[PDB]
Amino acid sequence: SGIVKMVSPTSKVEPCIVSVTYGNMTLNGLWLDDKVYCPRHVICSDMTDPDYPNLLCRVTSSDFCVMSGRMSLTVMSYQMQGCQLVLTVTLQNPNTPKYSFGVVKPGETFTVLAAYNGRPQGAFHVTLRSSHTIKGSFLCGSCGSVGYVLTGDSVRFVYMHQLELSTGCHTGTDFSGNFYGPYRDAQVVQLPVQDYTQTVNVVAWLYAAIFNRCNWFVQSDSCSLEEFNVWAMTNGFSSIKADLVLDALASMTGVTVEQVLAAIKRLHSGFQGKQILGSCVFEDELTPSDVYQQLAG
Amino acid sequence: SGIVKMVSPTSKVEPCIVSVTYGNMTLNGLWLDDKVYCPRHVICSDMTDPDYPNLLCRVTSSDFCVMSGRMSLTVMSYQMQGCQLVLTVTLQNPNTPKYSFGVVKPGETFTVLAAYNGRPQGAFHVTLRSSHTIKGSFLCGSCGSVGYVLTGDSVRFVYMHQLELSTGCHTGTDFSGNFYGPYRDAQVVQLPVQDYTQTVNVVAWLYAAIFNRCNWFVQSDSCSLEEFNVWAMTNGFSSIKADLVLDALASMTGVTVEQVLAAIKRLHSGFQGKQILGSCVFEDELTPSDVYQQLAG
Amino acid sequence: XAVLX
Amino acid sequence: XAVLX
């Protein structure tokens, strides 16, 4: 049946993408109801480490250029919240979906809708690392691209891109303005913290392999959950908790979670020429629910 | 700045997805203008190798229940074209985007909008192999899911899922009703033909690596394109033709196409434990245009 | 052997 | 050193 990195449909997020421009700088925003969320560094031009409290008082609402496609919105008021600006506009967005705000935890996934000049160009699958970073694809002009999850018919916005720590390593803010991890909206040295292999995802990826007729790593030995965590702290692996989806996967497959955990520690020492779903390394970018919907739905 | 497999935004395709029900079998369809395209396998029920010209005689329009969302659509007449049915419905689809019908060639990528019961569930990036297959993720109910390409504001529909040849290997029909590759909508054994690693995509992926720190594989030796094709016959690689986008990528990075081809041959025999964008194997699932738009846009 | 989806 | 996007 095959397994891929899937993304959520973008049809209810796309009509909310807008372009915010103050001074010389343009980035992307999210237009929900009568509000427009965007990163606060749209008012800097000061480079390096800005002084956002004092820079905000020269700011006047009429120097923001908000563009939904080719319609222009006007700013009544604004508000600095954390490291984002919440702009109030004249018009309620007529394509607002039922939406909430959330915070993803390490291991969990979401869809990033990459935008430039307030125009969506594509979407991709991302996993929050234990560094509180994501491995995305962003260039200049991409700040303000939102990360969201579809919870059926509603959108739970969770991410707003702002920063690139290292090559291929990105982070941003939730929609309360707070950065994921100990980072801030300044061009200061910010090396990411220690990262770990997301074990629950690697377990779910291996159950996916068993569903796809790839079970040569399954054996008789088992490793407990609490005995795995002891081993994980010293070999680059995250903690694992009980998971209903992992139990569902474990029943459908006929092999226990404890057998997969024991298979992981054996395969940490190399795959020995052979491949798991055409891979040489552990795949930890698919949560149990991501693996569950590509095996049952 | 990171390299991922991206997907086209789905806002123009989602409003076109319908469910088609005959007997009790339900699959998906595509609604454009007053036509609805869906696999002819919807009129079978009797397993194995159906007699489609014989089954058509008993089928009448009143036994199709096409629904867009909760709205019911009335079928006037129908027409079997190749391995698809073109159903003519009463209603002119009000959300029909500007569209065209195309045919993907091996190595070119597109986006599959996976649907169940006429309801979109997710989308993913896929690449047409030399075997005229794709590495997708489908289950029961997924036939009729469309694959498309975004071209400005236009949608070029190219794919209609129909068949799973083996574990993780799929194929289907263009919108003229013809299968990709020498396959057919029958439950007989059709294991895919020989596949090759898409060279043009591997070249583009290495240019992405060069633009993203990783350029250790670049050396002064060079292998011409036509000298590569004679080597590619016997090392599992496809033939390569000159390419502006590769020329543009070559001009940006300062590395000729012939240097990348020579680097491909040396790395066909081991990555030496080193990694290219965190990978230990070639990536042939990103076209030159996919790579260029994630390097510039 | 091929599965019709 | 981190780049503001």
PDB file of C-alpha atoms in Angstrom, chain A:
ATOM      1  CA  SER A   1       0.000   0.000   0.000  1.00  0.00           C
ATOM      2  CA  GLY A   2       2.911   2.384   0.451  1.00  0.00           C
ATOM      3  CA  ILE A   3       3.568   5.150   2.965  1.00  0.00           C
ATOM      4  CA  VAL A   4       4.364   8.814   2.282  1.00  0.00           C
ATOM      5  CA  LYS A   5       4.638  12.151   4.075  1.00  0.00           C
ATOM      6  CA  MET A   6       1.083  13.408   3.627  1.00  0.00           C
ATOM      7  CA  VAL A   7      -0.155  16.975   4.094  1.00  0.00           C
ATOM      8  CA  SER A   8      -3.537  18.384   5.053  1.00  0.00           C
ATOM      9  CA  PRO A   9      -5.729  19.977   2.367  1.00  0.00           C
ATOM     10  CA  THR A  10      -5.093  23.702   2.073  1.00  0.00           C
ATOM     11  CA  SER A  11      -8.477  24.993   0.882  1.00  0.00           C
ATOM     12  CA  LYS A  12      -9.598  26.630   4.129  1.00  0.00           C
ATOM     13  CA  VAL A  13      -6.179  28.126   4.946  1.00  0.00           C
ATOM     14  CA  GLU A  14      -5.436  29.626   1.496  1.00  0.00           C
ATOM     15  CA  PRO A  15      -8.229  32.282   1.551  1.00  0.00           C
ATOM     16  CA  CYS A  16      -6.739  33.654   4.795  1.00  0.00           C
ATOM     17  CA  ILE A  17      -3.222  34.297   3.484  1.00  0.00           C
ATOM     18  CA  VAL A  18      -2.485  38.026   3.141  1.00  0.00           C
ATOM     19  CA  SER A  19       0.582  40.217   2.649  1.00  0.00           C
ATOM     20  CA  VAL A  20       1.650  42.702   5.339  1.00  0.00           C
ATOM     21  CA  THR A  21       3.949  45.587   4.440  1.00  0.00           C
ATOM     22  CA  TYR A  22       5.362  48.268   6.749  1.00  0.00           C
ATOM     23  CA  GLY A  23       8.203  50.515   5.644  1.00  0.00           C
ATOM     24  CA  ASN A  24      10.384  48.669   3.167  1.00  0.00           C
ATOM     25  CA  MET A  25       9.517  45.164   4.315  1.00  0.00           C
ATOM     26  CA  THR A  26       6.840  42.719   3.186  1.00  0.00           C
ATOM     27  CA  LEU A  27       5.998  39.391   4.800  1.00  0.00           C
ATOM     28  CA  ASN A  28       2.958  37.122   5.067  1.00  0.00           C
ATOM     29  CA  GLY A  29       0.016  37.287   7.440  1.00  0.00           C
ATOM     30  CA  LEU A  30      -3.021  35.281   8.500  1.00  0.00           C
ATOM     31  CA  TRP A  31      -6.393  37.020   8.162  1.00  0.00           C
ATOM     32  CA  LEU A  32      -9.036  35.524  10.468  1.00  0.00           C
ATOM     33  CA  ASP A  33     -12.286  37.312  11.393  1.00  0.00           C
ATOM     34  CA  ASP A  34     -11.241  41.001  11.632  1.00  0.00           C
ATOM     35  CA  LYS A  35      -7.688  40.199  12.781  1.00  0.00           C
ATOM     36  CA  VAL A  36      -4.406  39.771  10.900  1.00  0.00           C
ATOM     37  CA  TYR A  37      -1.572  37.883  12.623  1.00  0.00           C
ATOM     38  CA  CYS A  38       2.003  38.413  11.417  1.00  0.00           C
ATOM     39  CA  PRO A  39       5.528  38.521  12.919  1.00  0.00           C
ATOM     40  CA  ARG A  40       6.349  41.695  14.821  1.00  0.00           C
ATOM     41  CA  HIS A  41       9.702  42.163  13.012  1.00  0.00           C
ATOM     42  CA  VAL A  42       7.744  43.679  10.091  1.00  0.00           C
ATOM     43  CA  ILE A  43       8.251  47.073  11.783  1.00  0.00           C
ATOM     44  CA  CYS A  44      12.020  46.931  12.332  1.00  0.00           C
ATOM     45  CA  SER A  45      14.407  47.675   9.427  1.00  0.00           C
ATOM     46  CA  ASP A  46      16.695  48.139  12.435  1.00  0.00           C
ATOM     47  CA  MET A  47      18.382  44.745  11.770  1.00  0.00           C
ATOM     48  CA  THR A  48      20.173  42.575  14.359  1.00  0.00           C
ATOM     49  CA  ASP A  49      18.494  43.094  17.760  1.00  0.00           C
ATOM     50  CA  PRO A  50      15.599  45.573  17.400  1.00  0.00           C
ATOM     51  CA  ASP A  51      13.994  47.600  20.183  1.00  0.00           C
ATOM     52  CA  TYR A  52      10.383  46.576  19.559  1.00  0.00           C
ATOM     53  CA  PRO A  53       8.876  48.428  22.580  1.00  0.00           C
ATOM     54  CA  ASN A  54      10.108  51.843  21.466  1.00  0.00           C
ATOM     55  CA  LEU A  55       9.835  51.119  17.728  1.00  0.00           C
ATOM     56  CA  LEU A  56       6.110  50.498  18.255  1.00  0.00           C
ATOM     57  CA  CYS A  57       5.225  54.093  19.221  1.00  0.00           C
ATOM     58  CA  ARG A  58       6.329  55.716  15.958  1.00  0.00           C
ATOM     59  CA  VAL A  59       4.107  53.075  14.320  1.00  0.00           C
ATOM     60  CA  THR A  60       0.779  54.343  12.975  1.00  0.00           C
ATOM     61  CA  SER A  61      -2.013  52.100  11.719  1.00  0.00           C
ATOM     62  CA  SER A  62      -2.122  53.788   8.309  1.00  0.00           C
ATOM     63  CA  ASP A  63       1.469  52.779   7.434  1.00  0.00           C
ATOM     64  CA  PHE A  64       0.526  49.074   7.231  1.00  0.00           C
ATOM     65  CA  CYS A  65      -0.295  47.753   3.756  1.00  0.00           C
ATOM     66  CA  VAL A  66      -2.457  44.621   4.041  1.00  0.00           C
ATOM     67  CA  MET A  67      -3.413  42.903   0.781  1.00  0.00           C
ATOM     68  CA  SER A  68      -5.795  39.953   0.427  1.00  0.00           C
ATOM     69  CA  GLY A  69      -5.028  39.106  -3.180  1.00  0.00           C
ATOM     70  CA  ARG A  70      -5.648  42.485  -4.778  1.00  0.00           C
ATOM     71  CA  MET A  71      -8.160  43.764  -2.229  1.00  0.00           C
ATOM     72  CA  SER A  72      -6.633  46.172   0.286  1.00  0.00           C
ATOM     73  CA  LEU A  73      -7.535  46.092   3.959  1.00  0.00           C
ATOM     74  CA  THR A  74      -7.072  49.055   6.279  1.00  0.00           C
ATOM     75  CA  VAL A  75      -5.719  48.845   9.824  1.00  0.00           C
ATOM     76  CA  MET A  76      -7.790  50.383  12.612  1.00  0.00           C
ATOM     77  CA  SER A  77      -5.699  49.313  15.618  1.00  0.00           C
ATOM     78  CA  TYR A  78      -2.858  46.938  16.399  1.00  0.00           C
ATOM     79  CA  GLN A  79      -1.381  45.086  19.360  1.00  0.00           C
ATOM     80  CA  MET A  80       1.998  43.511  20.077  1.00  0.00           C
ATOM     81  CA  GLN A  81       1.617  40.063  21.651  1.00  0.00           C
ATOM     82  CA  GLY A  82       4.811  38.154  22.265  1.00  0.00           C
ATOM     83  CA  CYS A  83       6.759  38.269  19.018  1.00  0.00           C
ATOM     84  CA  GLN A  84       3.766  38.793  16.702  1.00  0.00           C
ATOM     85  CA  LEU A  85       1.483  41.692  15.808  1.00  0.00           C
ATOM     86  CA  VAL A  86      -2.293  41.288  15.851  1.00  0.00           C
ATOM     87  CA  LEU A  87      -3.647  43.852  13.401  1.00  0.00           C
ATOM     88  CA  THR A  88      -7.298  44.860  13.514  1.00  0.00           C
ATOM     89  CA  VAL A  89      -8.765  45.588  10.083  1.00  0.00           C
ATOM     90  CA  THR A  90     -11.974  47.086   8.741  1.00  0.00           C
ATOM     91  CA  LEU A  91     -13.355  43.938   7.123  1.00  0.00           C
ATOM     92  CA  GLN A  92     -14.331  40.632   8.671  1.00  0.00           C
ATOM     93  CA  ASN A  93     -12.749  37.910   6.528  1.00  0.00           C
ATOM     94  CA  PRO A  94     -15.709  36.297   4.690  1.00  0.00           C
ATOM     95  CA  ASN A  95     -13.765  33.024   4.248  1.00  0.00           C
ATOM     96  CA  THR A  96     -12.915  32.445   7.907  1.00  0.00           C
ATOM     97  CA  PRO A  97     -13.087  28.716   8.719  1.00  0.00           C
ATOM     98  CA  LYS A  98     -14.045  27.339  12.100  1.00  0.00           C
ATOM     99  CA  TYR A  99     -10.655  27.677  13.750  1.00  0.00           C
ATOM    100  CA  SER A 100      -8.789  27.423  17.044  1.00  0.00           C
ATOM    101  CA  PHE A 101      -5.251  28.026  18.284  1.00  0.00           C
ATOM    102  CA  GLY A 102      -2.933  25.292  19.536  1.00  0.00           C
ATOM    103  CA  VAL A 103       0.634  24.400  20.464  1.00  0.00           C
ATOM    104  CA  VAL A 104       2.296  21.283  19.056  1.00  0.00           C
ATOM    105  CA  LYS A 105       4.666  19.264  21.235  1.00  0.00           C
ATOM    106  CA  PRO A 106       7.855  17.487  20.100  1.00  0.00           C
ATOM    107  CA  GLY A 107       7.195  14.504  17.849  1.00  0.00           C
ATOM    108  CA  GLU A 108       3.854  15.841  16.594  1.00  0.00           C
ATOM    109  CA  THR A 109       3.390  16.893  12.974  1.00  0.00           C
ATOM    110  CA  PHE A 110       1.571  19.614  11.048  1.00  0.00           C
ATOM    111  CA  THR A 111       1.297  21.088   7.556  1.00  0.00           C
ATOM    112  CA  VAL A 112       3.185  24.249   6.569  1.00  0.00           C
ATOM    113  CA  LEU A 113       1.632  26.360   3.796  1.00  0.00           C
ATOM    114  CA  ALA A 114       4.642  28.244   2.421  1.00  0.00           C
ATOM    115  CA  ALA A 115       3.706  31.706   1.144  1.00  0.00           C
ATOM    116  CA  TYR A 116       5.490  34.639  -0.474  1.00  0.00           C
ATOM    117  CA  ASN A 117       4.031  38.127  -0.894  1.00  0.00           C
ATOM    118  CA  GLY A 118       0.805  36.827   0.618  1.00  0.00           C
ATOM    119  CA  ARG A 119       0.371  34.155  -2.070  1.00  0.00           C
ATOM    120  CA  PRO A 120       0.514  30.425  -1.253  1.00  0.00           C
ATOM    121  CA  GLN A 121       3.084  28.565  -3.332  1.00  0.00           C
ATOM    122  CA  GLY A 122       3.056  25.076  -1.781  1.00  0.00           C
ATOM    123  CA  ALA A 123       2.676  22.926   1.310  1.00  0.00           C
ATOM    124  CA  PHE A 124       4.847  20.351   3.053  1.00  0.00           C
ATOM    125  CA  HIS A 125       4.932  17.935   5.989  1.00  0.00           C
ATOM    126  CA  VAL A 126       6.982  18.849   9.064  1.00  0.00           C
ATOM    127  CA  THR A 127       7.737  17.341  12.480  1.00  0.00           C
ATOM    128  CA  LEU A 128       8.517  19.364  15.588  1.00  0.00           C
ATOM    129  CA  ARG A 129      11.871  18.112  16.870  1.00  0.00           C
ATOM    130  CA  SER A 130      12.916  18.056  20.518  1.00  0.00           C
ATOM    131  CA  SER A 131      14.981  21.138  19.576  1.00  0.00           C
ATOM    132  CA  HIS A 132      11.562  22.768  19.113  1.00  0.00           C
ATOM    133  CA  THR A 133      12.595  23.244  15.476  1.00  0.00           C
ATOM    134  CA  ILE A 134      11.336  21.953  12.125  1.00  0.00           C
ATOM    135  CA  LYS A 135      13.148  20.848   8.977  1.00  0.00           C
ATOM    136  CA  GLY A 136      11.294  22.907   6.394  1.00  0.00           C
ATOM    137  CA  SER A 137      12.128  24.884   3.246  1.00  0.00           C
ATOM    138  CA  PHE A 138      12.043  28.675   3.584  1.00  0.00           C
ATOM    139  CA  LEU A 139      13.597  31.626   1.748  1.00  0.00           C
ATOM    140  CA  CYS A 140      13.432  35.402   2.147  1.00  0.00           C
ATOM    141  CA  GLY A 141       9.817  36.536   2.037  1.00  0.00           C
ATOM    142  CA  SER A 142       8.468  33.377   3.709  1.00  0.00           C
ATOM    143  CA  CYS A 143       8.037  34.692   7.273  1.00  0.00           C
ATOM    144  CA  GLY A 144       4.370  34.562   8.238  1.00  0.00           C
ATOM    145  CA  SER A 145       3.659  31.249   6.508  1.00  0.00           C
ATOM    146  CA  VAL A 146       1.344  29.337   8.821  1.00  0.00           C
ATOM    147  CA  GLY A 147       1.520  25.794  10.114  1.00  0.00           C
ATOM    148  CA  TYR A 148      -1.816  24.174  10.879  1.00  0.00           C
ATOM    149  CA  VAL A 149      -3.541  20.851  11.472  1.00  0.00           C
ATOM    150  CA  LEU A 150      -6.938  19.859  10.134  1.00  0.00           C
ATOM    151  CA  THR A 151      -9.084  18.418  12.920  1.00  0.00           C
ATOM    152  CA  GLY A 152     -11.849  17.213  10.607  1.00  0.00           C
ATOM    153  CA  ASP A 153     -13.622  20.366   9.426  1.00  0.00           C
ATOM    154  CA  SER A 154     -11.804  22.885  11.632  1.00  0.00           C
ATOM    155  CA  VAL A 155      -8.341  24.459  11.425  1.00  0.00           C
ATOM    156  CA  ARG A 156      -6.021  24.520  14.440  1.00  0.00           C
ATOM    157  CA  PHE A 157      -3.276  27.025  13.648  1.00  0.00           C
ATOM    158  CA  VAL A 158      -0.100  26.139  15.533  1.00  0.00           C
ATOM    159  CA  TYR A 159       2.853  27.736  13.770  1.00  0.00           C
ATOM    160  CA  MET A 160       3.982  31.021  12.204  1.00  0.00           C
ATOM    161  CA  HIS A 161       7.434  30.927  10.604  1.00  0.00           C
ATOM    162  CA  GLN A 162       9.947  33.571  11.707  1.00  0.00           C
ATOM    163  CA  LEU A 163      13.551  32.354  12.020  1.00  0.00           C
ATOM    164  CA  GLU A 164      16.204  30.063  10.539  1.00  0.00           C
ATOM    165  CA  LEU A 165      18.617  28.805  13.198  1.00  0.00           C
ATOM    166  CA  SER A 166      20.955  26.791  10.967  1.00  0.00           C
ATOM    167  CA  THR A 167      20.957  25.399   7.424  1.00  0.00           C
ATOM    168  CA  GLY A 168      17.677  23.526   7.017  1.00  0.00           C
ATOM    169  CA  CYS A 169      16.620  24.207  10.633  1.00  0.00           C
ATOM    170  CA  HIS A 170      13.672  26.535  11.234  1.00  0.00           C
ATOM    171  CA  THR A 171      11.431  27.698  14.077  1.00  0.00           C
ATOM    172  CA  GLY A 172       8.673  30.175  14.780  1.00  0.00           C
ATOM    173  CA  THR A 173       5.859  31.233  17.084  1.00  0.00           C
ATOM    174  CA  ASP A 174       2.485  29.911  18.092  1.00  0.00           C
ATOM    175  CA  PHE A 175      -0.538  32.196  17.761  1.00  0.00           C
ATOM    176  CA  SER A 176      -0.117  33.579  21.253  1.00  0.00           C
ATOM    177  CA  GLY A 177       3.197  35.060  20.070  1.00  0.00           C
ATOM    178  CA  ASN A 178       5.545  32.712  21.951  1.00  0.00           C
ATOM    179  CA  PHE A 179       8.480  31.102  20.164  1.00  0.00           C
ATOM    180  CA  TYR A 180       8.809  27.336  20.051  1.00  0.00           C
ATOM    181  CA  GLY A 181      11.852  26.643  22.199  1.00  0.00           C
ATOM    182  CA  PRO A 182      14.294  29.170  23.698  1.00  0.00           C
ATOM    183  CA  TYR A 183      14.556  31.402  20.620  1.00  0.00           C
ATOM    184  CA  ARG A 184      13.696  34.997  19.803  1.00  0.00           C
ATOM    185  CA  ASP A 185      13.163  37.248  16.776  1.00  0.00           C
ATOM    186  CA  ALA A 186      16.705  38.598  16.586  1.00  0.00           C
ATOM    187  CA  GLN A 187      19.640  37.864  14.271  1.00  0.00           C
ATOM    188  CA  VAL A 188      21.733  36.770  17.253  1.00  0.00           C
ATOM    189  CA  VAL A 189      23.672  33.527  17.676  1.00  0.00           C
ATOM    190  CA  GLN A 190      20.999  30.890  18.389  1.00  0.00           C
ATOM    191  CA  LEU A 191      22.388  27.374  18.027  1.00  0.00           C
ATOM    192  CA  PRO A 192      19.582  24.802  18.499  1.00  0.00           C
ATOM    193  CA  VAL A 193      19.456  22.708  21.655  1.00  0.00           C
ATOM    194  CA  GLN A 194      19.942  18.933  21.807  1.00  0.00           C
ATOM    195  CA  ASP A 195      17.724  16.851  19.507  1.00  0.00           C
ATOM    196  CA  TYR A 196      16.547  13.244  19.913  1.00  0.00           C
ATOM    197  CA  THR A 197      15.060  10.576  17.643  1.00  0.00           C
ATOM    198  CA  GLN A 198      11.280  10.583  18.200  1.00  0.00           C
ATOM    199  CA  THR A 199      10.790   6.970  19.271  1.00  0.00           C
ATOM    200  CA  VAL A 200       6.972   6.754  19.186  1.00  0.00           C
ATOM    201  CA  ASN A 201       7.190   7.856  15.548  1.00  0.00           C
ATOM    202  CA  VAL A 202       9.902   5.273  14.801  1.00  0.00           C
ATOM    203  CA  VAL A 203       7.702   2.580  16.364  1.00  0.00           C
ATOM    204  CA  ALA A 204       4.774   3.705  14.198  1.00  0.00           C
ATOM    205  CA  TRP A 205       7.014   3.772  11.126  1.00  0.00           C
ATOM    206  CA  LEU A 206       8.077   0.176  11.783  1.00  0.00           C
ATOM    207  CA  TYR A 207       4.459  -0.937  12.236  1.00  0.00           C
ATOM    208  CA  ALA A 208       3.905   0.715   8.867  1.00  0.00           C
ATOM    209  CA  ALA A 209       6.708  -1.462   7.498  1.00  0.00           C
ATOM    210  CA  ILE A 210       5.034  -4.618   8.841  1.00  0.00           C
ATOM    211  CA  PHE A 211       1.752  -3.621   7.164  1.00  0.00           C
ATOM    212  CA  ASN A 212       3.742  -3.286   3.918  1.00  0.00           C
ATOM    213  CA  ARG A 213       5.241  -6.811   4.090  1.00  0.00           C
ATOM    214  CA  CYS A 214       8.527  -5.724   5.704  1.00  0.00           C
ATOM    215  CA  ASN A 215       8.945  -7.603   9.000  1.00  0.00           C
ATOM    216  CA  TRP A 216      12.488  -9.031   8.908  1.00  0.00           C
ATOM    217  CA  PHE A 217      13.367  -7.054  12.077  1.00  0.00           C
ATOM    218  CA  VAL A 218      10.562  -8.604  14.156  1.00  0.00           C
ATOM    219  CA  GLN A 219      11.981 -11.249  16.491  1.00  0.00           C
ATOM    220  CA  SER A 220      11.177 -12.989  19.778  1.00  0.00           C
ATOM    221  CA  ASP A 221      12.895 -10.601  22.213  1.00  0.00           C
ATOM    222  CA  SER A 222      10.902  -7.804  23.854  1.00  0.00           C
ATOM    223  CA  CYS A 223      11.985  -4.596  25.561  1.00  0.00           C
ATOM    224  CA  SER A 224       9.768  -2.887  28.112  1.00  0.00           C
ATOM    225  CA  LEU A 225       8.720   0.738  27.774  1.00  0.00           C
ATOM    226  CA  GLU A 226      10.341   1.742  31.078  1.00  0.00           C
ATOM    227  CA  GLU A 227      13.416  -0.323  30.195  1.00  0.00           C
ATOM    228  CA  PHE A 228      13.638   1.401  26.809  1.00  0.00           C
ATOM    229  CA  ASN A 229      13.660   4.890  28.326  1.00  0.00           C
ATOM    230  CA  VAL A 230      16.699   3.901  30.410  1.00  0.00           C
ATOM    231  CA  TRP A 231      18.473   2.928  27.170  1.00  0.00           C
ATOM    232  CA  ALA A 232      17.148   5.915  25.201  1.00  0.00           C
ATOM    233  CA  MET A 233      18.775   8.651  27.314  1.00  0.00           C
ATOM    234  CA  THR A 234      22.248   7.466  26.272  1.00  0.00           C
ATOM    235  CA  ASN A 235      21.677   6.662  22.584  1.00  0.00           C
ATOM    236  CA  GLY A 236      19.864   9.642  21.100  1.00  0.00           C
ATOM    237  CA  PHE A 237      16.265   8.451  21.508  1.00  0.00           C
ATOM    238  CA  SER A 238      13.270  10.163  23.114  1.00  0.00           C
ATOM    239  CA  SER A 239      11.021   8.832  25.863  1.00  0.00           C
ATOM    240  CA  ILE A 240       8.018   6.694  24.919  1.00  0.00           C
ATOM    241  CA  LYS A 241       4.601   6.559  26.590  1.00  0.00           C
ATOM    242  CA  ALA A 242       1.662   4.228  26.092  1.00  0.00           C
ATOM    243  CA  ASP A 243      -0.338   5.104  22.973  1.00  0.00           C
ATOM    244  CA  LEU A 244      -3.776   3.812  21.998  1.00  0.00           C
ATOM    245  CA  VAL A 245      -2.902   4.019  18.293  1.00  0.00           C
ATOM    246  CA  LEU A 246       0.287   2.035  18.898  1.00  0.00           C
ATOM    247  CA  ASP A 247      -1.851  -0.550  20.704  1.00  0.00           C
ATOM    248  CA  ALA A 248      -4.300  -0.577  17.783  1.00  0.00           C
ATOM    249  CA  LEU A 249      -1.368  -1.015  15.394  1.00  0.00           C
ATOM    250  CA  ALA A 250       0.033  -3.703  17.710  1.00  0.00           C
ATOM    251  CA  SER A 251      -3.199  -5.713  17.654  1.00  0.00           C
ATOM    252  CA  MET A 252      -3.767  -5.482  13.899  1.00  0.00           C
ATOM    253  CA  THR A 253      -0.180  -6.545  13.198  1.00  0.00           C
ATOM    254  CA  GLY A 254       0.101  -9.328  15.778  1.00  0.00           C
ATOM    255  CA  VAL A 255       3.408  -8.084  17.240  1.00  0.00           C
ATOM    256  CA  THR A 256       3.754  -6.142  20.472  1.00  0.00           C
ATOM    257  CA  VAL A 257       5.109  -2.656  21.029  1.00  0.00           C
ATOM    258  CA  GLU A 258       7.778  -4.295  23.196  1.00  0.00           C
ATOM    259  CA  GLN A 259       8.978  -6.296  20.181  1.00  0.00           C
ATOM    260  CA  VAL A 260       9.294  -3.136  18.081  1.00  0.00           C
ATOM    261  CA  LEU A 261      11.138  -1.281  20.849  1.00  0.00           C
ATOM    262  CA  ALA A 262      13.557  -4.208  21.060  1.00  0.00           C
ATOM    263  CA  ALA A 263      13.896  -4.094  17.273  1.00  0.00           C
ATOM    264  CA  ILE A 264      14.808  -0.396  17.413  1.00  0.00           C
ATOM    265  CA  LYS A 265      17.758  -0.848  19.777  1.00  0.00           C
ATOM    266  CA  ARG A 266      19.090  -3.666  17.591  1.00  0.00           C
ATOM    267  CA  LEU A 267      18.734  -1.533  14.447  1.00  0.00           C
ATOM    268  CA  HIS A 268      20.338   1.479  16.140  1.00  0.00           C
ATOM    269  CA  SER A 269      23.579  -0.455  15.504  1.00  0.00           C
ATOM    270  CA  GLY A 270      23.085  -0.497  11.743  1.00  0.00           C
ATOM    271  CA  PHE A 271      20.592  -1.919   9.227  1.00  0.00           C
ATOM    272  CA  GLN A 272      23.104  -4.542   7.900  1.00  0.00           C
ATOM    273  CA  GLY A 273      22.614  -4.045   4.122  1.00  0.00           C
ATOM    274  CA  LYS A 274      18.829  -4.356   4.260  1.00  0.00           C
ATOM    275  CA  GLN A 275      16.170  -1.673   3.873  1.00  0.00           C
ATOM    276  CA  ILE A 276      12.996  -0.677   5.730  1.00  0.00           C
ATOM    277  CA  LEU A 277      10.504   0.690   3.188  1.00  0.00           C
ATOM    278  CA  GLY A 278      13.460   1.517   0.962  1.00  0.00           C
ATOM    279  CA  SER A 279      15.186   3.416   3.777  1.00  0.00           C
ATOM    280  CA  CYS A 280      18.606   3.076   5.414  1.00  0.00           C
ATOM    281  CA  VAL A 281      17.805   5.048   8.589  1.00  0.00           C
ATOM    282  CA  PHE A 282      14.992   5.466  11.091  1.00  0.00           C
ATOM    283  CA  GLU A 283      12.039   7.586   9.942  1.00  0.00           C
ATOM    284  CA  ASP A 284      10.697   9.629  12.863  1.00  0.00           C
ATOM    285  CA  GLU A 285       8.596  12.175  10.947  1.00  0.00           C
ATOM    286  CA  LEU A 286       5.327  10.182  11.040  1.00  0.00           C
ATOM    287  CA  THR A 287       3.217  10.106  14.211  1.00  0.00           C
ATOM    288  CA  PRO A 288       1.104   7.048  15.103  1.00  0.00           C
ATOM    289  CA  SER A 289      -1.990   8.838  13.773  1.00  0.00           C
ATOM    290  CA  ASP A 290      -0.215   9.596  10.496  1.00  0.00           C
ATOM    291  CA  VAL A 291       0.738   5.924  10.175  1.00  0.00           C
ATOM    292  CA  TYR A 292      -2.748   4.885  11.297  1.00  0.00           C
ATOM    293  CA  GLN A 293      -4.606   6.815   8.594  1.00  0.00           C
ATOM    294  CA  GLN A 294      -2.389   5.403   5.810  1.00  0.00           C
ATOM    295  CA  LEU A 295      -3.082   1.834   7.012  1.00  0.00           C
ATOM    296  CA  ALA A 296      -6.805   2.061   7.841  1.00  0.00           C
ATOM    297  CA  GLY A 297      -8.061   5.629   7.522  1.00  0.00           C
TER     298      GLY A 297
END
